Design a protein around this ligand. Structure first.
Ligand SMILES: Nc1ncnc2c1ncn2[C@@H]1O[C@H](COP(=O)(O)OP(=O)(O)OP(=O)(O)O)[C@@H](O)[C@H]1O
Ligand SMILES: Nc1ncnc2c1ncn2[C@@H]1O[C@H](COP(=O)(O)OP(=O)(O)OP(=O)(O)O)[C@@H](O)[C@H]1O
Ligand SMILES: Nc1ncnc2c1ncn2[C@@H]1O[C@H](COP(=O)(O)OP(=O)(O)OP(=O)(O)O)[C@@H](O)[C@H]1O
Lengths: 428, 321, 395
């Protein structure tokens, strides 16, 4: 009966939105983080190109952000959800060593094995916090351990190999205390280049003023205090946690996404165009590793919707995620140019009203900055002519603002449209 | 343990005039492109010819490479493949487990109180190839060991009273992301592996990777025009243990003229350089080619090819920097 | 015993009468501030902060297994000889559970090999559990001590691993660390990060970051000299204060809906203030400011013996927190000038160099009439060009 329930859920095409909403229900916003975490949890199918090479099925995630941006909450949720989860840290204070090492027993003078965090989390989800601070031995061994997923030792005849195949979901803080968009991702993070290169999905959590989200988060925190006293952004049903766990276990036991259905021509064209932009601009070039990450994310999506075959929608979603991460890792001007160039791929399965909301946010930011520059203080209500929004929508070939006004997202952000004055009014 | 049938096969294979290009293609079939690097690796694998003069000093016959370039160019896979094709080889990764030993060490077993004298990886790889990855991350002691082994080719152990000197005659093939200067000066050919944005090349590489991932199930598919790894091993061992070539008089004249012209041009350009060391490196490359074709004398074409390889690698590395 | 009425039963009738009198005092705030620190003159804000720390907040634990902080910490930074150590001395005198140190602190696992037992000697943090740990010379701590203090502030635990014995020891206490600015002179031009040599997480975890300035006020100097000479020449007693503090800590106020809405409004106002570029703040605000405000409101409710939080408590806490934060024309007009340039660049293709500058003169002059302002705008444009010309940098 549980299998039939899982099959029935697989029948519903729009289950991805459900499970994306389910990830970290207590956390508000950061939809990119939730999407990445869901993709990591569902995992990708691993392959073995003979003995010469091995293709790992893990989807690593790195979360570099700002202080007080709900980074540890995601790790806690993944620990509480995913089975075989190991929580560690790198700062110290009895922190478990990331990689195993052979240290001869001091009292008995015998060579012994001391397992690391990666070894204790094999076939599971490893979680690291404060990943920027690490021991030098760990700093030099993490690269190889993540590359080969196995630690091999040879000391005085003791030839032991330990298997460490785990999904790493790390977090850290940037250099200087804040993330500077002017500099590249590598400069902001106090980590060597190969270590960052090993991670597939890179997510940046910046801190910006969003008064609506500020008020909602304040309500959430105060209500949490009240509950412990002594809202669907995706707008779609949220799956039960237990049924979600059964679905995940099904997606790791009775499914094997094959890559027979593929369009290598479009992938090659995307690779060539992205490499053109990267090399011409002088920023970080796209390598084959990004292609492999895209393939793994595509297989993860295929398992996510319980399809034995990879529908081209999953390929487009994987390309979207990879492009979003890679573009966001660039410099500010480079990121702007790359967003301007690549817009068709990035717009796959994006709500038009969502883009209208982005345009409205831009206009509100303009008005607020103008008010603070001229009047010094701000104003409770913000009104901007609709004509600018209509023109920018025509630029993106969008229209029918009345349907957007009738949308619940328009009301939730405290927007009101004055037809008589042709003005959109927002209250705080 | 080689049967006469295999010897006949080796003679037939070496008799072909296109053995050089065949060996170049046979190296790392999976990796696409980089023909010049493959040719240089072939030259390294076959190696030069060792000589002894009446004074007792012996001129070494090894060839050393170095691959510098951006990450993501599959250096590690190439090094691993090279390690599996030489009759004798070893793989050490820099700063990872101290890159194996790389230093002959004298530890004391505490229970038995005995002293054990393990040689380094270089000693174990005598008369072979030593592939090192992450050359710039080397520990200082291993850096000293590398400096000593590349110059005198004798690793010495002086600790805890025990004082001996081991022997290590190995060709070093190392790859690093970016720049110790003395060791970089010791190397014969320095390849700066850049990247290109030819649309055809990028599309072909992406298609090849995608096809490999698609045919992970069809990994049993073979390749044509290449040489099996065991056959390559036996061929390398036979050529190394049978034929040691020497230069001819005409090749010597041509090389001397080219060297004189190069040095005069370099001096004139500096007024607006190639040294004897690089001349000997070119000599060793020519001898390696001659040994590869199983001949007792290296012709002028070998000298021309060695000059071309040197110009492609070391001269271009000097000019770019 | 944790029930307030239970301890009242333990207490005598006169003690209960005194407790009731203290609870009904309208000026209990000022009386407690004066009695707690009589010798020190001025600096009432720091006294109020220390009193709120002594009262503390209501701890909570989430259903998810996490635990919410119920303690607040205060760090004092001031010029030399500004009586900052006197605060710690009086706090230690009043508090029986206070543990004074001078920057061993965590634990000492000494194995009694005679009995083969790892007997652990409690450190400064352990002895100060469920109380206040005064740590003078906070800026002189070694890296190990800094790591231990940050771990104690983040996870309220003490982890020790000596001789292959890993253990975790609970430690829930408030820190009243005090330190001097780098160089002994507080530069108002520089922010708190530059003035004080402390690691970023440790600086971030702190609340009520009070700053002391000598100010060389002559009247205050006369008062100080007279106080010193008189020393050479209290509304409530310490016991009464201790009894009332225990009684108040036995309470547990809870937030109300009206107080909740007012808290949300005040947090919105504070975040708008921080985001405003009129005056640069010494430390950027986060959700931690909101959590600190909630803790301060709970402390105020405890002190006034009320069993529920009311908007007046939030008003007082917001005033104190706002006064805690210190804020460190040409740029004001330059921001809107950049706004106009960017908007015109997107809307219109034509973009000249000097002619657009001449137009921007009148564009900024649309609401003012001053030629001297126009020549000042030209000078500002010249300086900007000396720096950059609408370069691709952000903001
Ligand atoms: N969507 C959200 N956005 C922002 N804050 C949130 C959100 N949801 C919850 N919070 C709250 O924000 C606060 C941030 O504290 P938290 O422990 O998550 O910080 P952090 O990201 O781990 O910080 P640091 O970088 O210092 O380690 C918490 O009280 C958390 O409950
Ligand atoms: N022809 C090719 N050219 C470039 N990369 C290739 C090619 N074929 C495969 N690859 C892939 O490129 C990646 C490079 O792997 P490898 O670790 O060997 O190189 P690298 O990144 O240059 O090394 P390092 O970081 O140790 O300097 C691998 O994922 C490999 O599968
Ligand atoms: N209002 C006041 N402000 C400052 N000092 C005062 C005041 N009233 C009295 N004093 C006296 O002035 C002296 C202040 O110097 P004190 O030695 O206490 O400094 P400190 O905080 O220990 O300095 P540091 O730690 O920087 O060396 C003390 O003797 C104190 O009793």
């Amino acid at each position: 009966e549980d299998v039939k329930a899982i099959v029935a859920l697989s029948k519903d095409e729009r289950i991805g939105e459900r499970i994306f909403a389910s990830i970290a229900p207590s956390i508000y916003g950061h939809e990119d983080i939730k999407r990445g975490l869901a993709l990591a949890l569902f995992g990708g199918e691993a392959k073995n190109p003979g003995g010469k090479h091995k293709v790992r099925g893990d989807i690593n995630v790195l979360l570099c952000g700002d202080p007080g941006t709900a980074k540890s909450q995601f790790l806690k949720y993944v620990e509480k959800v995913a089975s075989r989860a190991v929580f560690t840290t790198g700062q110290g204070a009895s922190a478990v060593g990331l990689t195993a090492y052979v240290q001869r027993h001091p009292v008995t003078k015998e060579w012994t094995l001391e397992a690391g965090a990666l070894v204790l989390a094999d076939r599971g989800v490893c979680l690291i916090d404060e990943f920027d601070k690490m021991n030098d031995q760990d700093r030099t061994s993490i690269h190889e351990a993540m590359e080969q997923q196995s630690i091999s030792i040879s000391k005085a005849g003791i030839v032991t190999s330990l298997q460490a195949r785990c999904t790493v979901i790390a977090a850290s803080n940037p250099i200087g205390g804040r993330y500077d968009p002017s500099l590249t991702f590598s400069e902001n993070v106090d980590l060597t280049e190969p270590i960052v290169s090993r991670f597939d999905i890179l997510c940046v959590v910046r801190d910006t003023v969003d008064p609506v989200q500020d008020e909602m988060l304040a309500r959430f925190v105060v209500s949490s205090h009240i509950k412990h006293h002594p809202p669907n952004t995706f707008g779609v049903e949220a799956l039960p946690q237990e049924v979600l766990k059964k679905y995940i276990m099904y997606a790791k036991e009775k499914i094997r996404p094959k890559l027979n259905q593929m369009d290598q021509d479009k992938v090659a064209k995307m690779y060539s165009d992205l490499r053109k932009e990267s090399m011409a601009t002088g920023s970080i070039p796209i390598t084959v590793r990004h292609i492999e990450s895209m393939i793994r994310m595509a297989e993860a999506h295929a398992r996510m919707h319980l399809r034995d075959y990879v529908v081209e929608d999953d390929v487009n979603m994987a390309i979207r995620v990879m492009l979003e991460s890679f573009i966001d890792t660039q410099k500010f001007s480079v990121m702007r140019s790359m967003r301007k160039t690549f817009a068709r791929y990035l717009a796959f399965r994006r709500d038009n009203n969502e883009l209208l909301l982005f345009v409205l946010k831009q206009l509100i930011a303009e008005q607020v900055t103008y008010q603070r520059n001229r009047y010094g203080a701000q104003q409770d209500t913000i009104e901007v002519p609709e004509k600018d929004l209509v023109d920018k929508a025509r630029q993106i070939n969008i229209h029918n603002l009345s349907a957007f006004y009738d949308s619940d997202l328009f009301k939730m952000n405290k927007f009101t449209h004055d037809v008589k004055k042709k003005l959109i009014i927002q209250q705080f | 343990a080689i049967t006469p049938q295999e010897e006949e096969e080796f003679r037939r294979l070496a008799a072909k005039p296109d053995i050089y290009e065949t060996v170049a293609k046979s190296i790392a079939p999976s990796i696409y492109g980089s023909s010049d690097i493959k040719k240089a690796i072939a030259c390294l694998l076959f190696g030069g010819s060792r000589k002894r003069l009446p004074d007792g000093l012996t001129r070494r016959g090894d060839v050393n490479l170095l691959m510098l370039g951006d990450p993501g160019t599959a250096k590690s896979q190439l090094l691993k493949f090279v390690e599996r094709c030489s009759p004798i080889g070893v793989y050490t990764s820099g700063k990872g487990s101290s890159a194996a030993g790389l230093t002959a060490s004298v530890m004391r077993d505490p229970v038995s109180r005995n002293f054990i004298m393990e040689g380094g990886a270089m000693v174990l790889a005598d008369g072979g190839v030593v592939c090192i990855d992450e050359f710039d991350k080397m520990r200082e002691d291993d850096r000293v060991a590398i400096h000593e082994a590349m110059e005198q080719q004798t690793i010495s152990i002086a600790k805890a009273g025990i004082t001996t000197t081991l022997n290590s005659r190995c060709s070093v093939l190392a790859a690093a992301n970016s720049v110790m200067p003395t060791i970089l000066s010791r190397f014969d050919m320095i390849f700066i592996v850049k990247d290109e944005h030819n649309e055809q090349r990028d599309m072909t590489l992406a298609k090849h990777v995608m096809n490999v991932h698609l045919s992970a199930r069809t990994q049993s598919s073979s390749v044509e025009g290449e040489v099996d790894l065991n056959t390559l091993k036996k061929y390398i061992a036979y050529c190394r243990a049978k034929c040691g070539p020497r230069l001819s008089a005409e090749a010597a004249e041509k090389l001397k003229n080219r060297y004189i012209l190069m040095r005069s041009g370099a001096r004139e350009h500096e007024r607006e350089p190639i040294t004897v060391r690089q001349l000997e490196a070119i000599v060793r490359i020519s001898e390696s080619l001659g040994k590869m074709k199983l001949q007792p004398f290296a012709t002028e074409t070998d000298v021309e090819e060695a000059l071309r390889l040197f110009q492609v690698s070391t001269l271009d590395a000097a000019m770019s920097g | 015993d944790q029930t307030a009425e239970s301890i009242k039963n333990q207490m005598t009738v006169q003690e209960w009468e005194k407790v009731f009198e203290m609870s009904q005092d309208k000026n209990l705030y000022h009386n407690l501030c004066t009695s707690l620190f009589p010798t020190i003159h001025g600096n009432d804000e720091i006294k109020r902060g220390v009193l709120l720390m002594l009262f503390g907040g209501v701890p909570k634990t989430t259903m998810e297994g996490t635990s919410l902080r119920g303690d607040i910490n205060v760090c004092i930074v001031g010029d030399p000889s500004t009586s900052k150590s006197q605060f710690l001395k009086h706090v230690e005198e009043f508090s029986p559970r206070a543990v004074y140190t001078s920057g061993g602190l965590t634990a000492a696992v000494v194995k009694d090999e005679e009995s083969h037992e790892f007997v652990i000697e409690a450190g400064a943090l352990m002895l100060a559990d469920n109380g206040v740990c005064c740590i003078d010379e906070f800026d002189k701590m070694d890296l190990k001590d800094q790591v231990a203090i940050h771990e104690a502030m983040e996870q309220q635990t003490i982890s020790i691993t000596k001789a292959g014995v890993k253990a975790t020891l609970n430690a829930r206490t408030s820190i009243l660390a005090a330190a001097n600015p780098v160089g002994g002179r507080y530069e108002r031009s520089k922010s708190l990060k530059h003035n004080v040599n402390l690691s970023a997480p440790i600086m971030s975890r702190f609340d009520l970051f009070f700053i002391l300035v000598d100010e060389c006020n002559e009247v205050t100097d006369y008062a100080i000299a007279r106080r010193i000479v008189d020393l050479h020449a209290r509304v409530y007693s310490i016991e009464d204060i201790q009894r009332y503090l225990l009684f108040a800590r036995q309470f547990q106020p809870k937030i109300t809906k009206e107080a909740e809405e007012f808290i949300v409004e005040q947090y919105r106002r504070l975040r708008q203030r921080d985001g405003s570029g009129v005056a640069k703040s010494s430390w950027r605000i986060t959700v931690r400011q909101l959590e600190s405000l909630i803790r301060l409101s709970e402390s105020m409710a405890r002190m006034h013996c009320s069993d529920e939080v009311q908007p007046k408590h939030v008003k007082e806490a917001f005033r104190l927190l706002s006064k805690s934060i210190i804020r460190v024309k040409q740029i004001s007009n330059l921001l809107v000038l950049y706004m106009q340039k960017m908007e015109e660049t997107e809307e219109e293709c034509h973009l000249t160099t000097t002619d657009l500058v001449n137009w921007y003169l009148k564009e900024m002059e649309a609401e003012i009439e001053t030629e001297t302002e126009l020549i000042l705008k030209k000078r500002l444009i010249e300086k900007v060009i000396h720096r950059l010309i609408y370069y691709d940098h952000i903001l």
